[PDB]
Motif scaffolding. Structure first.
Motif, PDB file in Angstrom:
ATOM      1  N   UNK A 258       0.797  -1.223   0.000  1.00  0.00           N
ATOM      2  CA  UNK A 258       0.000   0.000   0.000  1.00  0.00           C
ATOM      3  C   UNK A 258       0.838   1.286   0.000  1.00  0.00           C
ATOM      4  N   UNK A 259       2.155   1.183   0.172  1.00  0.00           N
ATOM      5  CA  UNK A 259       3.018   2.374   0.239  1.00  0.00           C
ATOM      6  C   UNK A 259       3.263   3.093  -1.079  1.00  0.00           C
ATOM      7  N   UNK A 260       2.957   2.440  -2.185  1.00  0.00           N
ATOM      8  CA  UNK A 260       3.142   3.012  -3.504  1.00  0.00           C
ATOM      9  C   UNK A 260       2.052   2.470  -4.417  1.00  0.00           C
ATOM     10  N   UNK A 261       1.803   3.133  -5.547  1.00  0.00           N
ATOM     11  CA  UNK A 261       0.885   2.574  -6.534  1.00  0.00           C
ATOM     12  C   UNK A 261       1.423   1.329  -7.279  1.00  0.00           C
ATOM     13  N   UNK A 262       2.734   1.073  -7.216  1.00  0.00           N
ATOM     14  CA  UNK A 262       3.394  -0.048  -7.975  1.00  0.00           C
ATOM     15  C   UNK A 262       2.716  -1.400  -7.675  1.00  0.00           C
ATOM     16  N   UNK A 263       2.239  -2.064  -8.720  1.00  0.00           N
ATOM     17  CA  UNK A 263       1.612  -3.377  -8.601  1.00  0.00           C
ATOM     18  C   UNK A 263       2.594  -4.526  -8.612  1.00  0.00           C
ATOM     19  N   UNK A 264       2.364  -5.498  -7.728  1.00  0.00           N
ATOM     20  CA  UNK A 264       3.219  -6.655  -7.613  1.00  0.00           C
ATOM     21  C   UNK A 264       3.169  -7.299  -8.961  1.00  0.00           C
ATOM     22  N   UNK A 265       4.329  -7.603  -9.506  1.00  0.00           N
ATOM     23  CA  UNK A 265       4.381  -8.257 -10.798  1.00  0.00           C
ATOM     24  C   UNK A 265       4.255  -7.396 -12.021  1.00  0.00           C
ATOM     25  N   UNK A 266       4.185  -6.078 -11.873  1.00  0.00           N
ATOM     26  CA  UNK A 266       3.954  -5.201 -13.043  1.00  0.00           C
ATOM     27  C   UNK A 266       5.128  -5.177 -14.021  1.00  0.00           C
ATOM     28  N   UNK A 267       6.331  -5.491 -13.547  1.00  0.00           N
ATOM     29  CA  UNK A 267       7.482  -5.719 -14.433  1.00  0.00           C
ATOM     30  C   UNK A 267       8.252  -6.895 -13.884  1.00  0.00           C
ATOM     31  N   UNK A 268       8.932  -7.588 -14.788  1.00  0.00           N
ATOM     32  CA  UNK A 268       9.434  -8.921 -14.482  1.00  0.00           C
ATOM     33  C   UNK A 268      10.848  -9.177 -15.060  1.00  0.00           C
ATOM     34  N   UNK A 269      11.548 -10.147 -14.451  1.00  0.00           N
ATOM     35  CA  UNK A 269      12.807 -10.665 -14.961  1.00  0.00           C
ATOM     36  C   UNK A 269      12.541 -12.030 -15.568  1.00  0.00           C
ATOM     37  N   UNK A 270      13.061 -12.301 -16.770  1.00  0.00           N
ATOM     38  CA  UNK A 270      12.806 -13.606 -17.381  1.00  0.00           C
ATOM     39  C   UNK A 270      13.554 -14.714 -16.624  1.00  0.00           C
ATOM     40  N   UNK A 271      13.009 -15.915 -16.735  1.00  0.00           N
ATOM     41  CA  UNK A 271      13.553 -17.139 -16.154  1.00  0.00           C
ATOM     42  C   UNK A 271      15.015 -17.373 -16.462  1.00  0.00           C
ATOM     43  N   UNK A 272      15.432 -17.144 -17.692  1.00  0.00           N
ATOM     44  CA  UNK A 272      16.850 -17.323 -18.015  1.00  0.00           C
ATOM     45  C   UNK A 272      17.760 -16.423 -17.231  1.00  0.00           C
ATOM     46  N   UNK A 273      17.365 -15.173 -17.050  1.00  0.00           N
ATOM     47  CA  UNK A 273      18.196 -14.214 -16.352  1.00  0.00           C
ATOM     48  C   UNK A 273      18.225 -14.577 -14.869  1.00  0.00           C
ATOM     49  N   UNK A 274      17.106 -15.038 -14.318  1.00  0.00           N
ATOM     50  CA  UNK A 274      17.100 -15.481 -12.876  1.00  0.00           C
ATOM     51  C   UNK A 274      17.978 -16.694 -12.708  1.00  0.00           C
ATOM     52  N   UNK A 275      17.880 -17.648 -13.631  1.00  0.00           N
ATOM     53  CA  UNK A 275      18.815 -18.798 -13.638  1.00  0.00           C
ATOM     54  C   UNK A 275      20.237 -18.377 -13.497  1.00  0.00           C
ATOM     55  N   UNK A 276      20.604 -17.421 -14.308  1.00  0.00           N
ATOM     56  CA  UNK A 276      21.955 -16.911 -14.316  1.00  0.00           C
ATOM     57  C   UNK A 276      22.304 -16.196 -13.011  1.00  0.00           C
ATOM     58  N   UNK A 277      21.374 -15.469 -12.413  1.00  0.00           N
ATOM     59  CA  UNK A 277      21.659 -14.856 -11.122  1.00  0.00           C
ATOM     60  C   UNK A 277      21.992 -15.926 -10.068  1.00  0.00           C
ATOM     61  N   UNK A 278      21.190 -16.986 -10.085  1.00  0.00           N
ATOM     62  CA  UNK A 278      21.296 -18.069  -9.112  1.00  0.00           C
ATOM     63  C   UNK A 278      22.613 -18.809  -9.255  1.00  0.00           C
ATOM     64  N   UNK A 279      22.989 -19.024 -10.515  1.00  0.00           N
ATOM     65  CA  UNK A 279      24.252 -19.689 -10.860  1.00  0.00           C
ATOM     66  C   UNK A 279      25.475 -18.869 -10.514  1.00  0.00           C
ATOM     67  N   UNK A 280      25.408 -17.548 -10.651  1.00  0.00           N
ATOM     68  CA  UNK A 280      26.507 -16.716 -10.256  1.00  0.00           C
ATOM     69  C   UNK A 280      26.634 -16.499  -8.777  1.00  0.00           C
ATOM     70  N   UNK A 281      25.519 -16.470  -8.056  1.00  0.00           N
ATOM     71  CA  UNK A 281      25.506 -16.191  -6.608  1.00  0.00           C
ATOM     72  C   UNK A 281      25.878 -17.384  -5.731  1.00  0.00           C
ATOM     73  N   UNK A 282      25.835 -17.139  -4.431  1.00  0.00           N
ATOM     74  CA  UNK A 282      26.164 -18.089  -3.413  1.00  0.00           C
ATOM     75  C   UNK A 282      24.995 -19.093  -3.274  1.00  0.00           C
ATOM     76  N   UNK A 283      25.337 -20.339  -3.004  1.00  0.00           N
ATOM     77  CA  UNK A 283      24.339 -21.378  -2.725  1.00  0.00           C
ATOM     78  C   UNK A 283      23.888 -21.217  -1.287  1.00  0.00           C
ATOM     79  N   UNK A 284      22.711 -20.645  -1.087  1.00  0.00           N
ATOM     80  CA  UNK A 284      22.182 -20.407   0.276  1.00  0.00           C
ATOM     81  C   UNK A 284      21.214 -21.505   0.732  1.00  0.00           C
ATOM     82  N   UNK A 285      21.004 -22.509  -0.121  1.00  0.00           N
ATOM     83  CA  UNK A 285      20.112 -23.650   0.164  1.00  0.00           C
ATOM     84  C   UNK A 285      20.630 -24.408   1.374  1.00  0.00           C
ATOM     85  N   UNK A 286      19.882 -24.343   2.469  1.00  0.00           N
ATOM     86  CA  UNK A 286      20.329 -24.867   3.756  1.00  0.00           C
ATOM     87  C   UNK A 286      20.668 -23.822   4.818  1.00  0.00           C
ATOM     88  N   UNK A 287      21.008 -22.586   4.410  1.00  0.00           N
ATOM     89  CA  UNK A 287      21.645 -21.581   5.304  1.00  0.00           C
ATOM     90  C   UNK A 287      20.794 -20.343   5.647  1.00  0.00           C
TER      91      UNK A 287
END
Ligand code: AMP
Ligand code: FE
Ligand code: FE
Ligand code: ZN
Length: 287
Positions: A258-287
């Motif tokens: 409610x703090x802004x007019x911005x709608x959840x999901x109104x702009x998005x990152x494609x699956x491929x780019x998120x894949x790549x973020x996950x692959x470059x970042x730290x494995x936090x699964x478990x932590x």
């Protein structure tokens, strides 16, 4: 390129900073809207990470762990999105603690001045800080207190006036440089993206190509292109820079509930780019 029709909203704020909703509400709603995943990206903190992870696991929606870091480059305010880094990293932890303490100090001094002219007290602001010590405070909480006191109709009204950066009450927050933020995020094993870098309401002038080049040389991973604050010409400019340097291109809503007019999901990152973020970042699964 065009904004993706499906994917992840990786730019979402909660009560752990200036959003109005919990991490659980964010995850529940993101799933309901048919998003493939979401990120939490509160200002200068990881305080909502455990809650977001729990929600993600209970509700069954993939989650990116992120933070929006307040920074400055020469005279330009710059927000940096940092994803999938080690939250216990001592450099990034202490830089956040310093920014949160500087924010607290600044925001108090602003309320001290505002209270001479408006019916607000430090306690009215503290009433709008929803997770207490675990909330990163700033101007939105002042705006909220001024709405609770009846001075303005919306939080955005307050920002158009007394809480505006132009106003006589405004104080800037001491901030780390973009070069320091990028080194810290890469140090902590994360992925760093320049947020809404074409947005003029933020600044008298945008980051120049030269400033972007120096951040790219520092280790910048990406540019947030699909964002309501980036006009068409700036989207084309940023896409070109990203293509030339092989940067990741992201999108997100900057939802604050409610703090802004911005709608959840109104702009998005494609699956491929998120894949790549996950692959470059730290494995936090478990932590
Ligand atoms: N309704 C709103 N209007 C303007 N700014 C907002 C609003 N809600 C949250 N903000 C955020 O308030 C931040 C400025 O606060 P600060 O960092 O404390 O100066 C900017 O990053 C914002 O976009
Ligand atoms: Fe921002
Ligand atoms: Fe944001
Ligand atoms: Zn925010």
């Amino acid at each position: 390129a065009e904004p993706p029709a499906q994917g992840w909203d990786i730019h979402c704020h909660t009560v752990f900073s200036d959003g109005t909703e919990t991490p659980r509400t964010l995850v529940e709603q993101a799933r309901k809207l048919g998003l493939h995943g979401v990120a939490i990206a509160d200002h200068d903190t990881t305080a909502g990470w455990d809650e977001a992870t729990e929600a993600s696991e209970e509700i069954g929606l993939p989650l990116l762990l992120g933070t929006e870091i307040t920074a400055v480059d020469e005279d330009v305010s710059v927000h940096m999105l940092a994803f999938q880094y080690d939250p216990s990293n001592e450099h990034i932890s202490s830089m956040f603690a310093n920014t949160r303490a500087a924010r607290l100090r600044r925001t108090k001094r602003m309320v001290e001045r505002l209270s001479q002219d408006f019916p607000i007290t430090w306690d009215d602001v503290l009433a709008q800080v929803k997770e207490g010590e675990r909330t990163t405070i700033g101007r939105p909480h002042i705006a909220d207190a001024l709405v609770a006191a009846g001075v303005y109709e919306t939080r955005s009204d307050a920002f158009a006036d007394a809480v505006s950066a132009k106003s006589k009450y405004y104080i800037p927050t001491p901030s780390p440089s973009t070069h320091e933020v990028i080194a810290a995020v890469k140090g902590a094993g994360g992925v760093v993206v320049a947020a809404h870098a074409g947005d003029p309401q933020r600044n008298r002038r945008l980051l120049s190509d030269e400033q972007l080049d120096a951040m790219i040389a520092d280790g910048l991973d990406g540019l947030e292109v699909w964002h309501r604050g980036n006009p068409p010409e700036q989207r084309e400019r940023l896409l070109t820079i990203a293509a030339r340097h092989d940067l990741l291109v992201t999108g997100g809503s900057d939802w604050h509930g409610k703090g802004k007019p911005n709608g959840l999901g109104e702009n998005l990152t494609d699956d491929d780019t998120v894949r790549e973020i996950l692959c470059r970042g730290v494995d936090l699964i478990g932590r």
